[PDB]
């Protein structure tokens, strides 16, 4: 039931986050004769390595962002960045019980970079302030 959602509301879909997360890496190692034959296809072999290397790079890119924003190790992360009514002028019942994530993304795709920049800035300030308070 990998994409068992996307036909459910945003709220309901929060119950499948682990399933989606585990599609990468586990789905790669899992790939596990003539597999030796295929090593004679130089172009083919290079293309397959490029695909695997790229999948790893994509995975790590996203993990680094969670690191930067202070959400490392979590599937659900609360932050200190407030929501702007201009990004989306909708209420909680309105989106959580009606939109399906695919729709949501389409409606707020214009603010993606803005939001990410804000998340980084809040984390930068928080980390420094905590270290300064630790030192008496």
């Amino acid at each position: 039931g990998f994409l068992g959602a996307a036909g459910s509301t945003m709220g309901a879909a929060s119950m499948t986050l682990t399933v989606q997360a585990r599609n990468l890496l586990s789905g790669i190692v899992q790939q596990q004769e003539c597999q030796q034959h295929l090593l004679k296809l130089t172009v083919w072999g290079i293309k397959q390595l490029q695909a695997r290397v790229l999948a790893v790079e994509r995975y790590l890119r996203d993990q680094q962002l969670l690191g930067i924003w202070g959400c490392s190790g979590k599937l659900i992360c609360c932050t200190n960045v407030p929501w702007n009514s201009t990004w989306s002028n909708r209420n909680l019942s309105e989106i959580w019980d009606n939109m399906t994530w695919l729709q949501w993304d389409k409606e707020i795709s214009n603010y993606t970079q803005i939001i990410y920049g804000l998340l980084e800035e809040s984390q930068n300030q928080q980390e420094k302030n905590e270290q300064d308070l630790l030192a008496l």
Partner: protein, 445 residues
């Protein structure tokens, strides 16, 4: 002011994407005989139970005319094909002057001039020795120099190699499978148009098995959809686009090469052999295909009934045969039994709306229409051959510049290989999974 950004990872969303798919097989193709191009390439079996996931409420937009999976399949097939010839014998030594005669003996009049009996001086395994040998050739591959002196058709244009005598090109069904991070969505709408939204979408790991069957004009051994004949095209209105017609019932076509061939092997170098066509045993008769008129006339009537929806219920619809050009375009190019047929289909498109024997030519030196500059020589097959195939679709084009709107003319056409795959991959789309997203919630650190 109380809503905050919450970051989620593992959000079930996706975006359109272009990636590299890998091929997979049923295992059995390699487990049993191998010695064929697709069994050798598709080394990874599919899962025995590649269960699809139905997506409740999901509506997605498909476009078969921009489908990257088709473009990849085209590229992969050509590459595979070339790599299957790479290790075998070059036939450069045959590009000599030949001494040919008309065969004459036991020929039905329809076959006069089709075969030629040619003698030539070819090397032996030793550099300093030569042998005089002879073989039969089909007329189509032999071109007159300057009335007995002949050259092979490829000598002034291309290199020629011999197809590997032990390698089959049988269209064993293969499956395309997504890499992790990607998914293939498919449209289950029985009447899907080829473009636009589809409201019945499932997610799969691998596509259905697709037989990589090569043909032109008449599409063989594919899907019949389920309920009705579907006519689909990128434009319809623009006559320049090919119209792909998917039939809801197959038409059985019975093809044969009646002449009992033999084969001789000529040594041409250390470790190398040339496969030559030997004398025909028994009578010489013309190759042909049979279409039952009992089904063909009804089948076209169904196509017309649906075709009218775009042209008018009082419009005259005329079917006509092909225009000029190479046999790969003008005749039904057909690869079967290991030999290459070029069947004359004009007997199938000769009617106006408001058994049929198609004679066939045989060719051995093939400029596979993937490109020009490299010719393949197909070794002859001993005995006789018979093929029974399912016609599952047609590729038709329209004559532009028509005198008036009263009559439209449809002819067999196209032949570009992409349309032989586009017709099976039309229901599949590749998307990339994008696990990050944000939404407002009421929680703060």
């Amino acid at each position: 002011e109380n809503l905050w950004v919450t970051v989620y990872y593992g959000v079930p969303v996706w975006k359109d994407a272009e990636t590299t798919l890998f091929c997979a097989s049923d295992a059995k193709a390699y487990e049993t005989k191998k010695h064929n191009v697709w069994a050798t390439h598709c080394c990874v079996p599919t899962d025995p139970n590649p269960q699809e996931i139905h997506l409740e409420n999901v509506t997605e937009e498909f476009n078969m005319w921009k489908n990257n999976m088709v473009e990849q399949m085209h590229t992969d097939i050509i590459s595979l094909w070339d790599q299957s010839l790479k290790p075998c014998v070059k036939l450069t030594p045959l590009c000599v002057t030949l001494q040919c005669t008309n065969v004459t003996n036991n020929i039905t009049d329809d076959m006069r001039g089709e075969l030629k009996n040619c003698s030539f001086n070819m090397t032996t395994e030793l550099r300093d020795k030569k042998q005089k040998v002879y073989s039969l050739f089909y007329r189509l591959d032999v071109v007159q120099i300057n009335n007995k002196e002949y050259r092979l058709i490829n000598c002034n244009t291309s290199a020629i190699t011999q197809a590997c005598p032990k390698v089959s090109f049988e269209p064993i069904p293969i499956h395309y499978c997504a890499p992790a991070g990607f998914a293939i969505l498919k449209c289950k709408d029985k009447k899907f148009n080829g473009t636009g939204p589809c409201t019945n979408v499932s997610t799969v790991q691998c596509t259905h098995g697709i037989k990589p069957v090569v043909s032109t004009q008449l599409l063989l051994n594919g899907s019949l959809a389920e309920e009705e004949v579907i006519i689909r095209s990128e434009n319809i209105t623009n006559n320049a686009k090919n119209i792909l017609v998917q039939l809801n019932e197959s038409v059985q076509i019975n093809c044969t090469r009646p002449n009992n061939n033999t084969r001789k092997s000529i040594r041409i170098g250390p470790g190398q052999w040339f496969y030559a066509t030997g004398d025909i045993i028994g009578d010489i008769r013309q190759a042909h295909c049979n279409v039952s008129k009992a089904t063909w006339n009804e089948t076209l009537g169904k196509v017309v009934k649906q075709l009218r929806k775009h042209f008018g219920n009082n419009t005259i619809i005329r079917f006509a045969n092909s225009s000029g050009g190479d046999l790969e375009v003008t005749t039904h190019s057909f690869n079967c039994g290991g030999e290459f047929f070029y069947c004359n289909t004009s007997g199938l498109f000769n009617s106006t709306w408001i058994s049929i024997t198609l004679p066939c030519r045989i060719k051995q030196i093939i400029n596979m229409w993937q490109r020009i500059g490299q010719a393949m020589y197909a070794p002859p097959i001993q005995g006789v051959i018979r093929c029974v195939s399912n016609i599952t679709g047609l590729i038709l084009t329209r004559d532009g510049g028509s005198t008036n709107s009263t009559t439209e003319t449809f002819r067999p056409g196209g032949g570009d290989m992409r349309d032989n795959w586009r017709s099976e991959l039309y229901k599949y789309k590749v998307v990339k999974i994008e696990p990050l997203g944000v939404a407002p919630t009421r929680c703060k650190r």
